[PDB]
């Protein structure tokens, strides 16, 4: 049992999976991604967290993050926009899920790697740790 003297946070978005909600027909068909994170920062409640999130979850999370940022008196810090909305069709194709995944991975590492967010953002911890975000 050795604790890393330095604070750290490693995060990745991968392992995409497409689901059939009622298991019978395409109604509500959707793709979610797994966010895996390892950290020792005082804001977090466990070392390793593994959760799954939908793109709209990320979209919802971004609104929350941006608003929280404003309430913590940091009117000059900015959150990069997410990869982007996509047309229903190709939306479930391989190449599309892959590019969006890479986009989400990059976006997440950038957001979670920000000093101010790591120490003061409650929303960031919740997005990374809760079973369901909503």
C-alpha atoms as a printed R data frame, in Angstrom:
    type eleno elety resid chain resno       x      y       z
1   ATOM     1    CA   UNK     A     1   0.000  0.000   0.000
2   ATOM     2    CA   UNK     A     2   1.895  3.018  -1.360
3   ATOM     3    CA   UNK     A     3   0.221  6.377  -1.981
4   ATOM     4    CA   UNK     A     4   1.361  8.505  -4.902
5   ATOM     5    CA   UNK     A     5   2.875 11.722  -3.440
6   ATOM     6    CA   UNK     A     6   1.544 13.640  -6.437
7   ATOM     7    CA   UNK     A     7  -2.092 14.221  -7.312
8   ATOM     8    CA   UNK     A     8  -3.183 12.514 -10.512
9   ATOM     9    CA   UNK     A     9  -6.165 11.680 -12.711
10  ATOM    10    CA   UNK     A    10  -6.235  9.327 -15.678
11  ATOM    11    CA   UNK     A    11  -9.446  9.139 -17.669
12  ATOM    12    CA   UNK     A    12 -10.584  7.464 -20.875
13  ATOM    13    CA   UNK     A    13 -13.751  6.959 -22.898
14  ATOM    14    CA   UNK     A    14 -13.998  3.703 -24.815
15  ATOM    15    CA   UNK     A    15 -15.841  0.394 -25.197
16  ATOM    16    CA   UNK     A    16 -18.917  1.688 -27.070
17  ATOM    17    CA   UNK     A    17 -22.037 -0.497 -27.091
18  ATOM    18    CA   UNK     A    18 -25.371 -0.190 -28.889
19  ATOM    19    CA   UNK     A    19 -28.530 -1.355 -27.118
20  ATOM    20    CA   UNK     A    20 -32.086 -2.363 -27.924
21  ATOM    21    CA   UNK     A    21 -34.017 -1.050 -24.809
22  ATOM    22    CA   UNK     A    22 -37.069 -3.322 -24.855
23  ATOM    23    CA   UNK     A    23 -34.910 -6.008 -26.493
24  ATOM    24    CA   UNK     A    24 -37.483 -6.524 -29.262
25  ATOM    25    CA   UNK     A    25 -37.609 -3.570 -31.651
26  ATOM    26    CA   UNK     A    26 -35.458 -0.550 -32.510
27  ATOM    27    CA   UNK     A    27 -37.544  1.875 -30.438
28  ATOM    28    CA   UNK     A    28 -35.186  3.883 -28.254
29  ATOM    29    CA   UNK     A    29 -32.131  2.213 -29.790
30  ATOM    30    CA   UNK     A    30 -29.021  3.996 -28.528
31  ATOM    31    CA   UNK     A    31 -25.259  3.918 -28.053
32  ATOM    32    CA   UNK     A    32 -23.438  4.551 -24.780
33  ATOM    33    CA   UNK     A    33 -19.765  4.666 -23.877
34  ATOM    34    CA   UNK     A    34 -17.751  3.595 -20.881
35  ATOM    35    CA   UNK     A    35 -15.842  6.208 -18.920
36  ATOM    36    CA   UNK     A    36 -13.088  4.661 -16.797
37  ATOM    37    CA   UNK     A    37 -11.171  6.845 -14.366
38  ATOM    38    CA   UNK     A    38  -8.347  6.398 -11.845
39  ATOM    39    CA   UNK     A    39  -7.532  9.207  -9.425
40  ATOM    40    CA   UNK     A    40  -6.406 10.111  -5.907
41  ATOM    41    CA   UNK     A    41  -7.730 13.692  -5.819
42  ATOM    42    CA   UNK     A    42  -9.586 14.792  -2.645
43  ATOM    43    CA   UNK     A    43 -12.749 15.587  -4.664
44  ATOM    44    CA   UNK     A    44 -13.286 11.937  -5.589
45  ATOM    45    CA   UNK     A    45 -14.696  9.180  -3.373
46  ATOM    46    CA   UNK     A    46 -12.921  6.134  -4.824
47  ATOM    47    CA   UNK     A    47  -9.777  5.336  -6.803
48  ATOM    48    CA   UNK     A    48 -11.373  3.601  -9.785
49  ATOM    49    CA   UNK     A    49 -14.720  4.485 -11.295
50  ATOM    50    CA   UNK     A    50 -16.311  2.849 -14.336
51  ATOM    51    CA   UNK     A    51 -19.572  4.220 -15.686
52  ATOM    52    CA   UNK     A    52 -21.394  4.275 -19.001
53  ATOM    53    CA   UNK     A    53 -22.748  7.409 -20.623
54  ATOM    54    CA   UNK     A    54 -24.841  8.399 -23.642
55  ATOM    55    CA   UNK     A    55 -23.861 11.282 -25.899
56  ATOM    56    CA   UNK     A    56 -26.875 13.258 -24.675
57  ATOM    57    CA   UNK     A    57 -25.618 12.556 -21.145
58  ATOM    58    CA   UNK     A    58 -22.395 14.378 -22.147
59  ATOM    59    CA   UNK     A    59 -24.529 17.167 -23.639
60  ATOM    60    CA   UNK     A    60 -26.509 17.473 -20.416
61  ATOM    61    CA   UNK     A    61 -23.298 17.289 -18.384
62  ATOM    62    CA   UNK     A    62 -21.805 20.178 -20.407
63  ATOM    63    CA   UNK     A    63 -24.753 22.484 -19.653
64  ATOM    64    CA   UNK     A    64 -24.417 21.664 -15.929
65  ATOM    65    CA   UNK     A    65 -20.654 22.140 -15.975
66  ATOM    66    CA   UNK     A    66 -20.876 25.484 -17.722
67  ATOM    67    CA   UNK     A    67 -23.512 26.705 -15.273
68  ATOM    68    CA   UNK     A    68 -21.623 25.427 -12.227
69  ATOM    69    CA   UNK     A    69 -18.493 27.171 -13.530
70  ATOM    70    CA   UNK     A    70 -20.409 30.447 -13.504
71  ATOM    71    CA   UNK     A    71 -21.657 30.017  -9.929
72  ATOM    72    CA   UNK     A    72 -18.123 29.379  -8.636
73  ATOM    73    CA   UNK     A    73 -16.979 32.812  -9.803
74  ATOM    74    CA   UNK     A    74 -14.812 31.726 -12.744
75  ATOM    75    CA   UNK     A    75 -16.416 33.875 -15.519
76  ATOM    76    CA   UNK     A    76 -13.374 33.486 -17.756
77  ATOM    77    CA   UNK     A    77 -12.800 29.716 -17.820
78  ATOM    78    CA   UNK     A    78 -14.174 27.987 -20.913
79  ATOM    79    CA   UNK     A    79 -15.415 24.498 -21.744
80  ATOM    80    CA   UNK     A    80 -14.705 23.254 -25.273
81  ATOM    81    CA   UNK     A    81 -17.792 22.185 -27.216
82  ATOM    82    CA   UNK     A    82 -18.522 18.493 -27.666
83  ATOM    83    CA   UNK     A    83 -17.751 16.613 -30.937
84  ATOM    84    CA   UNK     A    84 -21.218 17.206 -32.372
85  ATOM    85    CA   UNK     A    85 -24.761 16.040 -33.048
86  ATOM    86    CA   UNK     A    86 -25.193 13.422 -35.786
87  ATOM    87    CA   UNK     A    87 -27.801 12.325 -38.359
88  ATOM    88    CA   UNK     A    88 -29.867  9.291 -37.256
89  ATOM    89    CA   UNK     A    89 -28.775  6.943 -40.097
90  ATOM    90    CA   UNK     A    90 -24.982  6.703 -40.055
91  ATOM    91    CA   UNK     A    91 -25.375  7.548 -36.362
92  ATOM    92    CA   UNK     A    92 -25.175  3.799 -35.641
93  ATOM    93    CA   UNK     A    93 -22.458  2.875 -38.122
94  ATOM    94    CA   UNK     A    94 -18.999  1.730 -37.067
95  ATOM    95    CA   UNK     A    95 -16.849  4.610 -38.318
96  ATOM    96    CA   UNK     A    96 -19.275  7.109 -36.806
97  ATOM    97    CA   UNK     A    97 -19.292  5.517 -33.351
98  ATOM    98    CA   UNK     A    98 -15.506  5.351 -33.522
99  ATOM    99    CA   UNK     A    99 -14.928  8.992 -34.415
100 ATOM   100    CA   UNK     A   100 -17.430 10.178 -31.816
101 ATOM   101    CA   UNK     A   101 -15.736  7.946 -29.250
102 ATOM   102    CA   UNK     A   102 -12.350  9.499 -29.992
103 ATOM   103    CA   UNK     A   103 -13.948 12.917 -29.778
104 ATOM   104    CA   UNK     A   104 -15.508 12.099 -26.396
105 ATOM   105    CA   UNK     A   105 -12.227 10.640 -25.116
106 ATOM   106    CA   UNK     A   106 -10.287 13.798 -26.013
107 ATOM   107    CA   UNK     A   107 -13.016 16.065 -24.693
108 ATOM   108    CA   UNK     A   108 -13.241 14.201 -21.365
109 ATOM   109    CA   UNK     A   109  -9.477 14.142 -20.729
110 ATOM   110    CA   UNK     A   110  -9.325 17.879 -21.375
111 ATOM   111    CA   UNK     A   111 -12.240 18.737 -19.103
112 ATOM   112    CA   UNK     A   112 -11.213 16.381 -16.306
113 ATOM   113    CA   UNK     A   113  -7.593 17.484 -16.580
114 ATOM   114    CA   UNK     A   114  -8.391 21.077 -15.673
115 ATOM   115    CA   UNK     A   115  -6.977 22.199 -12.258
116 ATOM   116    CA   UNK     A   116  -9.929 24.348 -11.282
117 ATOM   117    CA   UNK     A   117 -12.504 21.721 -12.208
118 ATOM   118    CA   UNK     A   118 -10.625 18.950 -10.375
119 ATOM   119    CA   UNK     A   119 -10.654 20.892  -7.114
120 ATOM   120    CA   UNK     A   120 -13.926 22.787  -7.249
121 ATOM   121    CA   UNK     A   121 -16.314 20.976  -9.593
122 ATOM   122    CA   UNK     A   122 -18.930 18.844  -7.866
123 ATOM   123    CA   UNK     A   123 -20.637 18.162 -11.204
124 ATOM   124    CA   UNK     A   124 -17.433 16.685 -12.702
125 ATOM   125    CA   UNK     A   125 -17.077 14.153  -9.890
126 ATOM   126    CA   UNK     A   126 -20.721 13.140 -10.155
127 ATOM   127    CA   UNK     A   127 -20.476 12.609 -13.932
128 ATOM   128    CA   UNK     A   128 -17.473 10.325 -13.415
129 ATOM   129    CA   UNK     A   129 -18.739  8.382 -10.410
130 ATOM   130    CA   UNK     A   130 -22.531  7.953 -10.351
131 ATOM   131    CA   UNK     A   131 -24.061  4.807 -11.835
132 ATOM   132    CA   UNK     A   132 -26.598  6.942 -13.675
133 ATOM   133    CA   UNK     A   133 -26.149 10.646 -14.320
134 ATOM   134    CA   UNK     A   134 -29.376 11.473 -16.228
